[PDB]
């Protein structure tokens, strides 16, 4: 998920995420990401793949737009 | 040895023993040793 | 710490710890109480120690209810002086407390947390104390 820095813009964490947002990504920019470094991964699907960075983005300081 | 009126388990690996009339605490950790007294 | 804001009388006779508690024997605010197993004059400084202990263990969180209050003035003759020549001076205030009185109660916190706080505050007190929890029996009074 090193790739996630050039889809929302940021280059750094948020130090205190949860209430603080400093960027955003939607339901579909997670699927493209759920594809690139995916001959590796673990699973083989797309919705078993997208929920793998959809919370690896909130572990720093970026949310998911729905 | 810590000698005290109040002997207790200090860490999860601590063990309370009674020997020859006297309550001790024994432990992996040498600092945890206690005889009551 | 605790003491009356004003009194009609500066000093009062010692009285007598006969009896079970007159009142205050059920929990009435929180979820857990500390109840006294022995009679005593509990002092303000003691109550205050008891309190502070509880907050320092909660560390932001919870409500402490303090259900006794020291309004009996405690007198003492100046060191090294003889008998007589009048009643001594007020050096503090105490709460008369008899067995079965709920002294403190807590709320808004876990059982594994009130337990400890109350375990601790007991230690500051000069008597034996049991920890209780609300019951229907409480609710019913």
């Amino acid at each position: 998920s090193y790739l996630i820095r050039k889809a929302a813009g940021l280059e750094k964490g948020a130090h205190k995420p949860g209430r603080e947002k400093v960027g955003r990504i939607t339901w579909e920019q997670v699927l493209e990401i759920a594809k690139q470094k995916m001959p590796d991964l673990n699973t083989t699907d797309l919705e078993a793949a997208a929920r793998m960075i959809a919370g690896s983005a909130r572990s720093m300081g970026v949310e998911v737009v729905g | 040895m810590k000698v005290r009126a109040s002997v207790k388990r200090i860490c999860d690996k601590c063990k309370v023993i009674r020997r020859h009339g006297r309550v001790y605490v024994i432990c992996e950790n040498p600092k945890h040793k206690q005889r009551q007294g | 710490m605790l003491m009356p804001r004003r009194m009609k009388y500066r000093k009062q006779q010692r009285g007598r710890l006969k009896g079970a508690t007159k009142g205050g024997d059920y929990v009435a605010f929180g979820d857990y109480g500390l109840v006294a197993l022995e009679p005593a004059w509990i002092t303000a400084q003691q109550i205050e120690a008891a309190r502070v202990a509880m907050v320092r263990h909660f560390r932001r969180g919870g409500k402490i209810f303090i259900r006794i209050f020291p309004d009996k003035p405690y007198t003492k003759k100046p060191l090294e002086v003889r008998m007589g020549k009048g009643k001594g001076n007020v050096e503090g205030y105490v709460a008369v407390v008899k067995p079965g009185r709920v002294m403190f109660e807590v709320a808004g916190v876990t059982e594994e947390q009130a337990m400890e706080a109350l375990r601790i505050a007991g230690h500051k007190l000069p008597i034996k104390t049991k920890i209780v929890r609300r019951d229907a029996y409480d609710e019913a009074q």
Partner: protein
Amino acid sequence: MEYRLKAYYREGEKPSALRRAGKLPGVMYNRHLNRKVYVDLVEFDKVFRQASIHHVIVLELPDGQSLPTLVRQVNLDKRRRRPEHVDFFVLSDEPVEMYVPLRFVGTPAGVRAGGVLQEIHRDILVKVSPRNIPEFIEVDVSGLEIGDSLHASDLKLPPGVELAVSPEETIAAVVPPEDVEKLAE
């Protein structure tokens, strides 16, 4: 929710005596009657502990009768925290005054913020026919920030079931939360 509990008549027996033997003296009554009874202490405990003053307990008398009661008061031994004696009010088909629980619903804004939900009332006085007790009564507390309260004036009410106390009577409050950053003063 329909609790029953075996209860036996007594006359000359000494309360001290019944008490030594596991039993808990008590009396059943209402506008029409008055009997001195006793119940096994641990049988009653298992029951009352969930029945409280809230749900009907049904008395299985030895003569065979089967009276629905509300527990009306429970005398405690002040020194030992034991129940000493029970009052059983024998429910008639008239409406009767009583206490019904308040379940506090949701999680207020004042919590999740630091604060504490002081539940000034954990049940409520209420006129109500016995043929419809609400084993609940919901109160939405979620709108509370620390500083706020809620009285009987709020609080829905099932039909029906009227209040039985001034709606000027506060029932909850969100107060701030102890905190060591106070203290030193």
